[PDB]
Amino acid sequence: DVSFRLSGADPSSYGMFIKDLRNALPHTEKVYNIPLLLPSVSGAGRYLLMHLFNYDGNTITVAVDVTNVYIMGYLALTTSYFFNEPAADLASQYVFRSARRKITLPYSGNYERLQIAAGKPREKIPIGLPALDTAISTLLHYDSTAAAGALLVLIQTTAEAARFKYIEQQIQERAYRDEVPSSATISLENSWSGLSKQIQLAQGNNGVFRTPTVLVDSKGNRVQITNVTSNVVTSNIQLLLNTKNI
Numbered sequence: 001d002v003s004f005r006l007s008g009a010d011p012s013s014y015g016m017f018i019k020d021l022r023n024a025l026p027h028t029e030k031v032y033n034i035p036l037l038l039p040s041v042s043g044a045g046r047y048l049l050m051h052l053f054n055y056d057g058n059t060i061t062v063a064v065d066v067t068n069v070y071i072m073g074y075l076a077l078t079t080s081y082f083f084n085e086p087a088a089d090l091a092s093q094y095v096f097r098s099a100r101r102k103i104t105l106p107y108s109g110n111y112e113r114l115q116i117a118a119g120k121p122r123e124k125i126p127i128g129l130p131a132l133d134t135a136i137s138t139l140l141h142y143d144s145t146a147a148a149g150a151l152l153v154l155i156q157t158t159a160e161a162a163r164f165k166y167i168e169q170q171i172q173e174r175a176y177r178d179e180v181p182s183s184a185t186i187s188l189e190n191s192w193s194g195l196s197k198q199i200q201l202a203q204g205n206n207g208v209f210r211t212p213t214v215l216v217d218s219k220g221n222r223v224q225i226t227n228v229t230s231n232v233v234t235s236n237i238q239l240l241l242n243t244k245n246i
């Protein structure tokens with residue numbers, strides 16, 4: 001299990017949490033010095049439990065698929081909550097079994113369905129440590145519309161930060177003040193699968209991408225990533241989605 005506490009939290013303590021989250025994900029192989037997530041894990045071992053504590057010390061436990069860093073659901077007191085999708089239903093067979101009741105959320109866990117349910121694109125949803133504190137508090141008591149926004153915050157401040165050093169840094173900048181994600185942040189989130197595939201395909205292609213990945217940079221300009229010498233590969237991305245899952 002990994003844990004993060006919002007009470008007394010700073011850029012340093014959050015950085016330690018994101019480090020712990022990454023290190024909790026199993027790998028047997030590194031591709032270009034980047035941990036390669038496993039094709040599959042059988043049983044309960046597929047799911048990492050994140051214990052998150054809001055400022056007041058109230059807590060939720062989030063279940064994360066260790067093969068793709070995908071949030072399946074969470075436990076709030078005696079109620080478990082799971083996304084409306086097969087992978088999350090599978091997860092419910094293994095995690096939070098001691099919960100008195102299980103609620104299936106009226107949406108799947110992908111960005112498209114969450115944004116529809118929240119009524120806004122995540123381009124308009126402020127993120128950061130304060131937002132995460134709100135998110136935890138919101139998930140403590142069931143409210144499906146409010147939960148959609150909270151989960152968008154949660155996904156970006158945990159899973160996406162684990163996947164990209166840039167996003168981790170973005171949240172660290174937002175330690176005491178929330179701000180909507182940069183277009184670069186949105187770009188990276190949308191491109192994790194694409195980048196993971198092309199980095200793996202570069203192995204056997206002299207570090208060259210079979211298909212160039214189009215991103216948006218810090219300034220807001222559109223750029224092409226064509227090989228492993230790019231900063232996105234050498235510095236940014238921290239975990240690779242296995243091609244078997246793409």
Ligand SMILES: *[C@@H]1O[C@H](CO)[C@@H](O)[C@H](O)[C@H]1NC(C)=O
Pocket residue numbers: 208226227229230231
């Ligand atoms: C690799 O990408 C860089 C940009 O990061 C570019 O300058 C260089 O020409 C590329 N090399 C090859 C062999 O494609």
Ligand SMILES: Nc1ncnc2[nH]cnc12
Pocket residue numbers: 069070071072109110111155159160
């Ligand atoms: N549920 C989820 N967990 C992690 N990353 C995601 N990206 C989109 N949906 C996600």
